């Protein structure tokens, strides 16, 4: 019973703790699964699509931001749209002022700076959205994970959403065999990782997967339904 | 719920300020209107007699413009503020979009203001509902009735305030084409309607009509006592 | 309840849940009308009568396996209802914050108000199916509608419910547990052996299954609760299979027959499941 | 409850918060203001508990113009702020109007400025009441400012500790017939009545306002009057 | 653990236990008081029908404009709190016109719904007077339109989320309507076939019986602009039950 | 709009008690003694001297960076008592304050005027709803033009006065008692039988003889009016003079 | 319906009965838990009712493995004839529209049973204190007239502080001094009902701060201790009671589960 | 306890409880160490590896904040980032206007003033983090300052913050840092880190190190890999 203390973002508990932030932490894993692996040369984004509203076309998780950066969402749609709108605005400002893509490691820092703003002040809430951002620049392929903790994590393969931990275990096991993969095999590995989150009774369909890719020469293209057939096909079962 | 964010959704969603102000108009003095073939009557009682009053100041019936009048019920001062703001907007429209405004447009403006007293923790909801009535640009009769929620429905004829329901289901039980053919019978229906609710006779019921394209004419305590003239119509021909 | 304007008085609520201000004649008049409003009617469906006498006195029972929670009811329905033939003597007429909107409907196929079922070969087995949230007074109302104050010593109860792993409290972080997982609680008289480890001492259960368990234990009735702590309350396959160890207990040995046909029934049900919003919640 | 806000009246339409301010004023230091046919004298108690204190680095009665004196009974800093900014108001009045403000419009100023604090919320009422001595066209004026924003003009009044007995003592001991010099003596008598602590030279600050304008009394003069 | 004090929704934008905001799901099923509305999106066009649940005979039915068009090729269906629903509508209209003159074409339906969703979500700036509600909208919206998609349908919930849904029903009987519709829906549907099935399910769901005045429907097809059905059209449609 | 004050007499400063006593002010007053330090301020006809402990319960610390004597002007200095952070801030505040004074009136601010302005700043805190009173008391020394040295001390309440000799901190009551005793009888205080008496005060009230590492002393002299701080090269010699009697 | 755990006779003809007052902090409940922990009262029976919101635990007073598996609900009864003590433990909270009839039924059952003393543990909102109670100790006591007239010597010796009951029609200057416990839960109702039934009963309450109430609970159990002496005279310099009052095993982590290793 | 719901509150005995909560917040995080040597300043922070998945270098806590000062944090990461990039305009606002390089004392006294500003307002909560400030220059030698959420600034000969604070400092003072050069310092720093490091509860950590001083000529920079590796070898063989 410390529920005097888990009620406003701006109130500390007598544990050196903020409970609203960790509630926002728990909020995102009620979203949808995702995968954020990487290669020497490619960054792809595997996502599971809300195949619960049947006979109604579903949502979109992988959102194009800039030709060299794309993102994914797993938390509050509202925060997701606001943050992606800010993403587009900042990328356009960068390409305007500098006539060059914005390197990711700075954009993500700005993300963190912005989302920290409500963390400290009364009358606001943390941006309860989980973000996987994928991008490529002169430094090379990158995957950055973002949490409503206003703190981001630079990983090379991440999963946020329901049952993500199984995918995380699978990715930590297969860590080594991502460094050298052509596009299709990298996407296949991410697909297998996502599939493991699904129950064995389920299969990744073209109707519920939203692969998106950026590359050294392939600008961030989002692969929606049946267009993902070539990647999905040829996939061995569990 | 309690004080803060004065307009909070209810656990089921029953926005408490809305129906709380809704209840404000059941202690509001009963008003009513009828949209006739070529005349519109706007009747309202004043069962707070205080016969040592100036009736001029305590009318319920205010006129919005050359082509619009209204009545209300509830917190009087709030209604006065509404009336002044609506008059200002009507003047602005007649300046900018110069034309006599239609009843629907001013009603929609009223509803927009009324419902925009729902944001902005700040401002509290208004405790009035109105009976906007007037003749259009074309001369057709019109009628519009709103509620603190923000809805701005239109009626053949409606009543608001204290015991408004009983008046309503008297009204459809008697509202018919062979009740509006004559202006005298048109007003007589309103007379009887409040007779059902009045303090036992033609006591302090203030009303006025607006025939087409002339003005708001105050139905006055004439030598015949216009009020009790129609009143005695019902007294000695309701048998 | 402050910040209507700048510089104001907060007035935090109370920690015993005492913000009820510690009863005028019109108050208990409206209390009479309100109590008669929120009626838990043991409705004999299509007849709605002949059920004043409670079940333990209306019909002697031997097994009352009850599911509370959308996933619990899905689990029991799919793994038992398909096995045997279960007709409904009646259900519970329940209005509250949940299952609102004119409870008398098409039977609320994608909702639930405690629909009971009994078998053909041995009609002594009852199954109550509902995730409906009955009011704090209404648990007692319903329980004495079905059971009454005469606790018989021939019937046994299995209870299923789910609560979020966020609620569970252990020395390690919740987001580090192998969710979903299982916990159980036994009555004082429930000498029957369990299949899953008991709940840790600090963490408790405060709800309708707690009501049922309190009734059974206090009145010496042997009963058992079964509890899975999952991460999602939606209609979930995985949390369905989380309860699979129940398919070995003594009370269930003679019911479950076919697993894969159950699994295909589940895929049918959750392919046609609710239209649960795309907010990600 | 209904006694925490300053923004809601009591169920009896009765401002508890102002009453608490009033009680705080009652808890202040004793103060006396005596009107007379030729001047007005203000007297009050110095409570420098330790002799380490200096009486006269700071002061209790503050001049505002040639002919204005202020004294209070409550918490010092509130009084100091109010003096400092009533000075702003009076200085306005002379800037706009080439003639020193009459005392009345000053107490209008001050009453308004404290009242607005009462009706703002989030700001506590000014927990101190004020006394005003003045001389307009050559005739004395005496005002008491109530922290509620009320202002009352008195023939003579006393505030601070035990002020009810002070007022009663004044009732049977003052007349319109008096002059300034004996008014000083009788005001000292009033303070002695409820002094609790054996008057020395160095416990009362004294200010007077005549035609020659308001001005304090030096401690030499306090001793000088107390001689007889 | 023992239940103690807790401020629940004192602040707007307070995350619930298990991370699920208050006002948003308070309004989601404050919606369920709203009238049932049906929308079918087939290749031939879309149809938007809704009950008006006439409370009393003393209203003439013409007043309740439950259905409006955002523009000549974007019709809108709404259910729930009409009050701020009209502000939603007015923003949609002004945004459509803004796109139209700034960009000389017809603003596409998807962008319209996306901008409308943008309009929501601005709850807490209680200190900041400009741009406020401090209250989520309590109205669900349905958009029909024709463009280089042609027929389209978008459902909005009071959470700033939407979908390219088709055959999506909202209202008090929303779940029953959706369930019946699922088994009723056909992938290739002719225009009055959608009209017919939707009208049958409406007759099946609502409390009061069905006549011309009881409901209304409107359609847009690639042929021409928004059409709002008149009375005699409703009799000549409901002739066949 | 804002979070607001917690409903209660002692819960927030703005609410008056039934006798209109400001609780949060008392809470600040008995919040001053946090840190255990107690300071003493005495002044003679030529000098004004303020002395306090230098608690260094860690030798990872640097003695230089830890202090409580903060020069405000080259002529005017001060001492701090209370929590460290609010003392930080008010030192900043008064430095700015006096600088603005000199800029806007063309002459060095008098000690009393600086004290008054700081008292005003402290007071305005007790007016608002999300202000918290700066729980620290700050003491001045300086030579104005003719009045020689003055000692001034504001407080969280905003009350201040000029002191012939004063003190603040934990053993404040005992310091004041010894100060009264000394001031009543012996009162010349040129420079050595001077404030060194206050060092005797601080030692007697607090502990055994001090050796200067624990003591921090700053002075201003009428004939040499710089705010300037003596060291263990200096304070030691003083205190060996004091030890012998 | 007071049901013993085994359909036995608790014969509570003269055992002092203890119950806590559901109030801010649940300081009464916490203090009672500490009392049962330190004196090890055994569970004899249940006080069954349709009044409180139902919770279930598994013997929060667990000491060994054997007693850990004992199911526990909100309503149990612990008694100890070794020092003539019986205790009523309440875990959950009060349902709306039900507290007062519950109190009436409780006193009816007490009359049916007839315990010696009906001492109550309570607490009050610390922000609703006048200056007279703000200047002084947070310890307060109320005793029914039936039993105060006999024991008053001990309280007179121990220097407690009598709560000043305030006008319950306050604005009238001649209205009666009358019971008023802010944030008292069912405490005032219990006291008024007890004096109406002329039942010897005691009310002890403290003004409580917020958050953890371990200092509050220990203060309250000590405040019960000096009068009851249900445990050895503490002899304030503890040397034991600093580690004699053994905390119930259930009082593990309360504020949460643990630090989620994702943000620090 | 109790009166701990706003920063702008005072305890019954005069404490700001929601600064002590931040004091225990920095306790939650992991240890960070910085030692000032004869002619430079050396930092060192051990980072908990939450998962092998994360790319090395993420969650860095060794922030370059200008050319000549360096910064290491502990406590809440996001607010640490916030204060970090605050300290990179206070530098600009001192160099863009005053040209030369920021002295450490002034930079601390402002950033400490900033965090104290946050620790005194109800509308905000204190930054639940503490951090270090180290640098070196020929005109100023080497300095080290520690900042806690309370707003207090202190220069340290050697200091640490985190959940092994006590053990860290107790291992620190056993060294003659005032007369040792950086090469002898780095090995000692890693030694302290590994000695105080807890694994049985916090296995899977990582070592990170950086310095600034004479060896890099007043330029803050991360420890070169080879020195890091040989120091790690020393720490392991120091067992």
CB contact at 8 A, G185 and C17: no
- Rounded to a whole number, what is the distance in Å from the CA of A208 to chain G's nearest CA? 29
C6 neighbourhood in chain D, CB within 8 Å: 121-122
Range of the domain at D182: 1-228
What residues have CB less than 8 Å from G119, skipping those under 6 apart? G16, G17, G18, G201, G202, G203, G204, G224, G228
In this complex, is the C-beta atom of F127 within 8 Å of any C-beta atom belonging to chain C?
Answer: no
d(CA E69, CA G187): 62
Distance between E230 CA and the closest CA of chain C, angstroms: 32
Length of chain H: 239
Six token digits for residue B133: 């009535």
Query: What domain count does chain B have?
Result: 1
Give contacts of A13 with chain H, Cβ < 8 Å. Answer: 21
CB-based contact, F6 to chain A, within 8 Å? no
Task: List chain G residues with CB under 8 Å of F9.
Answer: 127, 129, 131, 134
How far does G23 lie from chain C, in Å, by closest CA?
A: 5
Token code pair at residue C17: 């849940």
Of the candidates A192, A169, A189, which has an alpha carbon nearest to the alpha carbon of residue A181? Answer: A189
CATH code where residue H228 lies: 3.60.20.10
Q: Which of C217, A88, E70 is nearest to G73 (CA)?
A: C217
Q: What is the CATH number of the domain that holds E217?
A: 3.60.20.10
Question: CA–CA separation, D148 vs D115, rounded Å?
Answer: 6
Q: C67 φ, ψ to 5°?
A: -115, 125
Q: Which domain holds residue B128?
A: 1-239
Q: Which residue reads 């309009």 in tokens?
A: E119
Peptide bond preceding B192 in cis form (omega within 30 of 0):
no
Decide if B3 and C97 are in contact by the 8 Å CB cutoff: no
Nearest to C211 by CA among C269, C144, C264: C144
Convert B16-26 to b/e letters by CB count within 10 Å (16 or more is b): ebbeebbebbe
**Chain F residues near residue G134 by CB distance under 8 angstroms:** 9-10, 17, 23
Q: Do the Cβ atoms of G88 and G17 come closer than 8 Å?
A: yes
Beta strand spans in chain H (E)? 32-36, 40-48, 62-64, 69-75, 129-137, 141-147, 153-155, 158-161, 205-213, 221-222
Name the helix (H) or strand (E) containing A34: strand A34-35
From residue G118, alpha-carbon distances to G85, G113, G225 in Å are 11, 12, 15
Residue of G209, G261, G264 lying closest to H1 (CB–CB): G209
Number of H helices, E strands in chain A: 6, 9
Give me the residue from D24, D50, D58 closest to F176, CB to CB: D50
Q: Where are the alpha helices (DSSP H) in A44-103?
A: 77-98
Query: Which run of H or of E encompasses F137?
Result: strand F136-143
Q: Do H121 and F29 touch (CB under 8 A)?
A: no
G263 interface with C at CB cutoff 8 Å: no
> Which chain G residues contact residue E6 at CB under 8 A?
none
Q: Residue C5 and residue D4: Cβ atoms within 8 Å? A: no
User: What is the radius of gyration, based on Cα positions, of chain G?
Assistant: 19
Cβ neighbours of residue C196 closer than 8 Å, sequence gap 6 or more: C182, C183, C184, C226, C245
State how far residue A199 is from chain C, nearest Cα, in angstroms.
7
To the nearest whole angstrom, how far is the Cα of G233 from the nearest Cα of chain E?
32
The total domain count for chain F is 1
Chains D and A touching, counted as 3 or more CB pairs less than 8 Å apart: no
* Residues in D touching C7 (Cβ below 8 Å): 121-123
**DSSP strand pairing (B68-74 vs B128-135):** antiparallel
Calpha distance C239→C241 (Å, rounded): 5
Residues 128-187 of A with CB under 8 A from C: 162-163
Sheet strands (E) in A59-192: 63-66, 69-73, 131-136, 141-147, 151-154
Measured between beta carbons, the chain G residues lying within 8 angstroms of E5 are 24
Residues 6 or more apart whose CB falls under 8 angstroms from that of B172 comprise E56, E57, E58
- To which H or E segment does residue E182 belong? helix E174-184
Q: Which residues of H lie closer than 8 Å to A, measured between beta carbons?
A: 1, 4-6, 17-18, 21-28, 50-55, 57-59, 76-79, 81-82, 85, 118, 122-128
CA angle, corner B126, sides to B124 and B130, nearest 5? 165
Contacts F2 to A, Cβ<8 Å: 122-123
- Contact of A135 with A87, CB cutoff 8 Å: no
Query: For residue C9, what is the nearest residue in chain D, using CA coordinates?
Result: D5
Residue E2 lies in a domain: no
Among A22, A116, A155, the strongest candidate for a mutation testing the G interface, having the largest count of G CBs within 10 A, is A22
Chains near G with 3+ CB pairs less than 8 A apart are A, C, E, F, H
C224: Cβ–Cβ under 8 A, 6 or more apart, which residues? Answer: C156, C157, C158, C159, C184, C185, C186, C187, C190, C192, C194, C251
- Cα separation, D208 vs D199, whole angstroms: 20
Q: Which domain holds residue A103?
A: 3-236
Residues of G with CB under 8 A from a CB of F: 126-131, 134
Sign of CA dihedral F196, F198, F199, F201: positive
- The residue segments making up the domain with residue F93 are 2-245
Contact flag E12-B5 (C-beta cutoff 8 Å): yes
Residues 12-41, chain A: which have Cβ within 8 Å of H? 12-18
In a domain, E52, yes or no: yes
G25 in E contact zone (CB under 8 Å) = yes
Nearest CA in chain C to F9: C9
A17/G259 CB distance under 8 A: yes
Chain E hits for A24, Cβ within 8 Å: 15, 19
Q: Are strands G55-57 and C205-206 parallel, antiparallel or unpaired?
A: antiparallel
Asked if the Cβ–Cβ distance from B5 to C3 is below 8 Å, we say: yes
Q: Find chain G residues with C-beta within 8 A of H78's C-beta.
A: 263
- In a mutagenesis test of the F interface, which of A12, A121, A122, A124 is the best target, namely the one with the most F β-carbons within 10 Å? A122
Domain that holds residue E124: 9-241
In the beta sheet, which residues pair with residue C223? C157
CATH of the domain at B97: 3.60.20.10
Residue F209 CB neighbours (<10 A): 10
Strands H129-137 and F161-162: unpaired
Minimal C-alpha gap between E131 and chain C (Å): 18
Nearest C-alpha in A relative to E9? A7
End-to-end distance of chain A based on CA atoms, in angstroms? Answer: 44
Its domain, for residue H167, covers: 1-238
Instruction: Work out the minimum CA distance from F218 to partner chain G, whole angstroms.
Output: 40
Residues of G in contact with C17 (CB under 8 A): 22, 93-94
Query: What was the experiment behind these coordinates?
Result: cryo-EM
Cα–Cα distances (Å) from F132 to C1, F27, F211, H20, H119, in that order, read 21, 11, 37, 16, 10
The closest CB to that of H52, out of A122, A153, A172, belongs to A172
Query: B153, E59: Cβ pair inside 8 Å?
Result: yes
Q: Do chains H and F touch (3 or more CB pairs under 8 A)?
A: yes
Neighbors of chain B by Cβ distance (3+ pairs < 8 Å): C, E
The CATH number of the domain holding residue A175 is 3.60.20.10
The pairing of beta strand C125-129 with beta strand C63-67? parallel
CB contact under 8 A, E63 and B154: yes
How many other CB atoms sit within 10 Å of the CB of residue B172? 14
Reference A25, options A12, A9, A39, A47; nearest CA is A9
Neighbours of chain D (3+ CB pairs under 8 A): C, F
d(CA B15, CA B1): 10
- Partnered with residue B45 across adjacent β-strands are B205
Strand pairing class (F47-53; F215-221): antiparallel
Write down the number of H helices and E strands in chain B.
Answer: 7, 9
Number of domains in chain H: 1
d(CA B94, CA B104): 15
- Structure tokens of C198? 């008991």
Domain count, chain D: 1
Q: Which of G55, G68, G95 minimises the CB distance to C201?
A: G68
Is G3 touching C (CB cutoff 8 A)? yes
Number of domains composing chain A: 1
Residue of C nearest to B13 (CA): C97
Q: Of A190, A162, A212, A202, nearest to C276 (Cα)?
A: A162
């Amino acid at each position: 019973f410390r529920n005097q203390y888990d009620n406003d973002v701006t109130v500390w508990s007598p544990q050196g703790r903020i409970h609203q932030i960790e509630y926002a932490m728990e909020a995102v894993k009620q979203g949808s699964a995702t995968v954020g692996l990487k290669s020497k040369t490619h960054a792809v984004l595997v996502a599971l699509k809300r195949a619960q509203s049947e006979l109604a076309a579903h949502q979109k998780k992988i959102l194009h931001v800039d030709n060299h950066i794309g993102i994914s969402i797993a938390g509050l749609t509202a925060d997701a749209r606001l943050l992606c709108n800010f993403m587009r605005q900042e990328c356009l400002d960068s390409r305007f002022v500098f006539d060059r893509p914005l390197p990711v490691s700075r954009l993500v820092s700005l993300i963190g700076s912005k989302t920290q703003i409500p963390t400290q002040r009364y009358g606001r809430r943390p941006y309860g959205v989980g973000l996987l951002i994928a991008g490529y620049d002169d430094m090379g392929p990158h995957i950055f994970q973002t949490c409503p903790s206003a703190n981001y994590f630079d990983c090379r393969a991440m999963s946020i959403g329901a049952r993500s931990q199984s995918a995380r275990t699978y990715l930590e096991r297969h860590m080594s065999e991502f460094m050298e993969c052509n596009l299709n095999e990298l996407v296949k590995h991410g697909l297998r990782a996502l599939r493991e989150t699904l129950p064995a009774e389920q299969d990744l369909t073209t109707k519920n997967v939203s692969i998106g890719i950026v590359g050294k020469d392939l600008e961030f293209t989002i692969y929606d339904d049946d267009d993902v057939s070539p990647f999905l096909e040829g996939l061995e079962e569990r | 719920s309690y004080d803060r964010a004065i307009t909070v959704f209810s656990p089921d969603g029953h926005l408490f300020q809305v129906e709380y102000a809704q209840e404000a108009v059941k202690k509001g003095s009963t008003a009513v209107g009828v949209r006739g073939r070529d005349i519109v009557v706007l009747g309202v009682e004043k069962k707070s007699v205080a016969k040592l009053q100036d009736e001029r100041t305590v009318r319920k019936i205010c006129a919005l413009d050359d082509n619009v009048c209204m009545a209300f019920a509830g917190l009087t001062a709030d209604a006065r503020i509404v009336i002044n703001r609506a008059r200002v907007e009507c003047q602005s429209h007649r300046l900018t979009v110069e034309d006599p405004v239609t009843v629907e447009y001013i009603t929609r403006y009223i509803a927009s203001l009324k419902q925009r007293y729902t944001q902005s923790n700040g401002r509290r909801p208004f405790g009035i509902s109105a009976l906007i009535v007037g003749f259009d640009f074309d001369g057709t009769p019109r009628l519009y009735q709103t509620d603190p929620s923000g809805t701005y429905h239109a009626w053949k004829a409606n009543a608001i305030g204290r015991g408004a329901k009983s008046v309503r289901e008297f009204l459809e039980k008697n509202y018919t084409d062979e009740a509006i053919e004559t202006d005298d019978l048109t007003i007589k229906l309103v007379i009887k309607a409040l007779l059902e609710v009045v303090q036992s006779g033609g006591k302090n019921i203030e009303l006025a009509v607006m025939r087409r394209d002339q003005s708001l004419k105050i139905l006055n305590p004439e030598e015949i006592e216009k009020y009790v003239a129609e009143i005695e119509k019902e007294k000695e021909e309701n048998e | 309840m402050a910040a209507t304007f700048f510089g104001e008085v907060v007035k935090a609520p109370c920690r015993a849940g005492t913000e009820d201000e510690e009863e005028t004649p019109e108050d208990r008049e409206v209390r009479l009308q309100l109590a008669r409003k929120r009626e838990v009617r043991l409705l004999r469906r299509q007849t709605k009568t002949s059920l004043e006498v409670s079940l333990l006195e209306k019909y002697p029972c031997s097994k009352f396996i009850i599911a509370i929670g959308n996933n619990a009811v899905a689990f029991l329905s799919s793994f038992v209802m398909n096995s045997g033939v279960w007709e409904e003597v009646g259900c519970a007429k329940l209005w509250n914050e949940w299952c609102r909107t004119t409870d008398t409907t098409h039977l609320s196929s994608t909702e639930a108000f405690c629909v009971f079922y009994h078998l053909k070969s041995n009609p002594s087995v009852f199954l109550c199916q509902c995730s409906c949230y009955v009011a704090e007074d209404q648990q007692y109302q319903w329980l004495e509608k079905v059971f009454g104050s005469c606790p018989r010593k021939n019937m046994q109860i299995t209870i299923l419910t789910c609560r979020h792993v966020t609620d569970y409290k252990t020395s390690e972080s919740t987001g580090s547990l192998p969710s979903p997982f299982l916990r159980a609680l036994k009555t004082q008289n429930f000498k029957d052996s369990a299949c899953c480890p008991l709940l840790e001492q600090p963490n408790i259960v405060h709800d309708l299954p707690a009501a049922v368990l309190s009734y059974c234990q206090v009145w010496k009735i042997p009963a058992i609760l079964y509890l899975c702590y999952t991460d999602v309350m939606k209609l979930d396959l995985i949390t369905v299979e989380a309860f699979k160890p129940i398919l070995s207990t003594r009370s269930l040995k003679g019911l479950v027959k076919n697993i894969p046909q159950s699994t295909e029934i589940l895929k049918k049900l959750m392919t046609t499941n609710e239209i649960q919003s795309n907010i990600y919640t | 409850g209904y006694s925490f806000s300053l923004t809601t009246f009591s169920p009896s339409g009765k401002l508890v918060q102002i009453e608490y301010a009033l009680a705080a004023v009652a808890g202040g230091a004793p103060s006396v203001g005596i009107k007379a046919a030729n001047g007005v004298v203000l007297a009050t108690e110095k409570k420098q508990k330790s002799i380490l204190y200096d009486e006269r680095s700071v002061h209790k009665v503050e001049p505002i113009t040639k002919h204005i004196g202020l004294v209070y009974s409550g918490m010092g800093p509130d009084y100091r702020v109010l003096v400092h900014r009533a000075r702003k108001l009076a200085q306005q009045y002379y800037l706009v109007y080439q003639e020193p403000i009459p005392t009345a419009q000053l107490v209008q100023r001050v009453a308004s400025v404290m009242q607005e604090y009462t009706q703002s919320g989030g700001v506590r009422p000014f927990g101190v009441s004020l006394l005003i001595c003045g001389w307009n066209e050559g005739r004395p004026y005496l005002f008491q400012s109530d922290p509620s924003g009320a202002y009352f003009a008195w023939k003579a009044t006393a505030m601070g500790k035990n002020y009810v007995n002070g007022k009663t003592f004044l009732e049977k001991r003052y007349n319109e017939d008096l002059e300034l010099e004996d008014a000083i003596h009788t005001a000292i008598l009033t303070l002695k009545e409820s002094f609790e602590g054996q008057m020395t030279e160095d416990n009362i600050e004294v200010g007077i306002c005549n035609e020659a304008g308001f001005r304090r009394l030096t401690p030499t003069e306090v001793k000088d009057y107390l001689a007889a | 653990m023992f239940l103690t004090r807790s401020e629940y929704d004192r602040g707007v934008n307070t995350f619930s236990p298990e991370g699920r905001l208050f006002q948003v799901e308070y309004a989601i099923e404050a919606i369920k008081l709203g009238s049932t509305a049906i929308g079918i999106q087939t290749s031939e066009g879309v149809c938007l029908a809704v009950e008006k649940r006439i409370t009393s005979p003393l209203m003439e039915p013409s007043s309740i404009e439950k259905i409006v068009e955002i523009d000549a090729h974007i019709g809108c269906a709404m259910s729930g709190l009409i009050a701020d629903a009209k502000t939603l509508i007015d923003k949609a209209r002004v945004e459509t016109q803004n796109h139209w003159f700034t960009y000389n074409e017809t603003m596409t339906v998807e962008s319209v719904t996306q901008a409308v969703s943008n309009l929501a979500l601005q709850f807490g700036e209680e200190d900041a007077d400009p741009g406020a509600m401090s209250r989520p909208f309590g109205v669900a919206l349905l958009f029909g339109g024709v463009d280089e998609k042609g027929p389209q349908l978008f459902h909005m919930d009071p959470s700033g989320t939407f979908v390219q849904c088709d055959a999506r029903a909202i209202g008090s009987a929303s779940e029953g309507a959706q369930s019946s519709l699922q088994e009723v829906y056909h992938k290739s549907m002719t225009l009055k076939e959608a009209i017919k099935s939707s009208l049958i399910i409406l007759k099946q769901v609502m409390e009061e019986k069905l006549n011309a005045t009881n409901i209304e429907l409107a359609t847009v097809q690639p042929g021409q602009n928004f059409h709002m059905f008149t009375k005699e059209e409703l009799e000549e449609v409901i002739k066949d039950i | 709009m804002s979070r607001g004050s917690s409903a209660g007499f002692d819960r927030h400063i703005t609410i008056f008690s039934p006798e209109g006593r400001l609780y949060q002010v008392e809470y600040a007053f008995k919040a001053i003694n946090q840190g255990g330090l107690t300071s003493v301020a005495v002044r003679g006809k030529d000098c004004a001297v303020i002395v306090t402990q230098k608690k260094v319960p860690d030798k990872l610390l640097d003695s230089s960076t830890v202090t409580h004597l903060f020069k405000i002007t080259e002529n005017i200095g001060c001492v701090m008592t209370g929590m460290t952070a609010d003392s930080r801030s008010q030192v900043q505040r008064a430095r700015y304050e006096a600088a603005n004074w000199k800029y806007k009136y063309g002459y060095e601010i008098p000690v009393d005027m600086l004290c008054k302005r700081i008292a005003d700043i402290s007071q305005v805190y007790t007016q608002n709803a999300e202000m918290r009173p700066l729980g620290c008391c700050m003491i001045l020394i300086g030579i104005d033009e003719e009045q020689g040295p003055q000692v001034y001390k504001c407080d969280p309440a905003g009350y201040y006065c000029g002191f012939k000799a004063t003190a603040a901190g934990v053993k404040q009551t005992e310091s004041t008692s010894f100060l009264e005793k000394k001031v009543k009888k012996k009162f010349d205080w040129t420079f050595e039988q001077t404030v060194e008496t206050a060092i005797t005060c601080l030692s007697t009230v607090l502990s055994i003889d001090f050796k200067p590492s624990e003591i921090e002393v700053g002075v201003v002299t009428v004939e040499n009016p710089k705010f300037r701080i003596l060291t263990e090269a200096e304070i030691d010699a003083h205190l060996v003079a004091l030890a012998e009697r | 319906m007071f049901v013993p755990c085994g359909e036995s006779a608790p014969d509570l003809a003269g055992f002092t009965l203890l119950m806590p007052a559901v109030s801010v902090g649940n300081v009464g409940q916490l203090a009672m838990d500490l009392i049962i922990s330190t004196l090890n009262m055994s569970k004899i029976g249940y006080f069954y009712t349709d009044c409180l919101v139902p919770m279930v635990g598994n013997n929060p007073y667990a000491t060994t493995e054997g007693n850990s598996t004992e199911l526990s609900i909100n309503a149990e009864v612990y008694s100890l004839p070794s020092r003539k003590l019986v205790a009523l433990q309440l875990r959950s909270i009060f349902i709306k529209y039900k507290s007062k009839p519950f109190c009436e039924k409780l006193l009816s059952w007490v009359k049916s049973s007839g315990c010696a003393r009906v001492i109550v543990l309570s607490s009050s909102h610390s922000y609703q204190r006048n200056d007279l109670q703000l200047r002084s100790t947070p310890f307060r006591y109320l005793l029914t007239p039936s039993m105060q007239k006999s024991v008053q010597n001990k309280i007179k010796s121990l220097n407690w502080e009598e709560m000043e009951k305030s006008r319950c029609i306050p604005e009238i200057d001649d209205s009666e001094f009358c019971i008023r416990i802010p944030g008292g839960g069912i405490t005032k109702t219990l006291y008024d009902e007890s004096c109406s039934k002329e039942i010897q009963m005691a009310v002890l309450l403290k003004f409580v701060s917020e958050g953890d109430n371990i200092p509050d609970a220990l203060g309250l159990v000590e405040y019960l201790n000096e009068w009851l002496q249900i445990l050895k005279p503490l002899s304030d310099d503890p040397t034991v009671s600093a580690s004699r009052w053994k905390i119930p095993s259930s009082w593990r982590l309360l504020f949460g589960s643990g630090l989620p290793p994702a943000l620090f | 306890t109790g009166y701990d719901l706003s920063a702008s509150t005072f305890s019954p005995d005069g404490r700001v409880f929601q600064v002590e909560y931040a004091m225990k917040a920095v306790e939650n995080s992991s240890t960070a160490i910085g030692i000032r040597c004869k002619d430079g300043v050396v930092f060192g922070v051990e980072k908990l590896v939450l998962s092998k998945l994360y790319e090395e270098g993420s969650n860095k806590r060794l922030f370059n904040v200008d050319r000549h000062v360096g910064m290491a944090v502990a406590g809440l990461l996001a607010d640490a980032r916030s204060l970090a990039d605050i300290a990179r305009e206070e530098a600009s606002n001192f160099r863009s206007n005053f040209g030369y390089n920021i002295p450490l004392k002034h930079l601390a006294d402002r950033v400490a003033m900033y965090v104290h500003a946050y620790t005194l307002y109800s509308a905000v909560r204190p930054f639940g983090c503490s951090f270090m400030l180290g640098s070196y220059s020929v005109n100023d030698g080497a300095q080290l300052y520690m900042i806690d959420p309370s707003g207090v600034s202190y220069g340290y000969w050697g200091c640490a913050i985190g959940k092994a604070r006590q053990a860290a400092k107790t291992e620190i003072e056993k060294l003659q840092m005032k007369e040792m050069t950086c090469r002898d310092i780095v090995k000692e720093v890693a030694k302290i880190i590994y000695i105080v490091h807890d694994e049985v509860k916090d296995k899977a950590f990582e070592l990170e190190l950086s310095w600034v001083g004479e060896l890099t000529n007043g330029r803050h920079e991360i420890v070169p890999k080879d020195i890091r590796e040989e120091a790690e070898k020393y720490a392991k063989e120091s067992l």
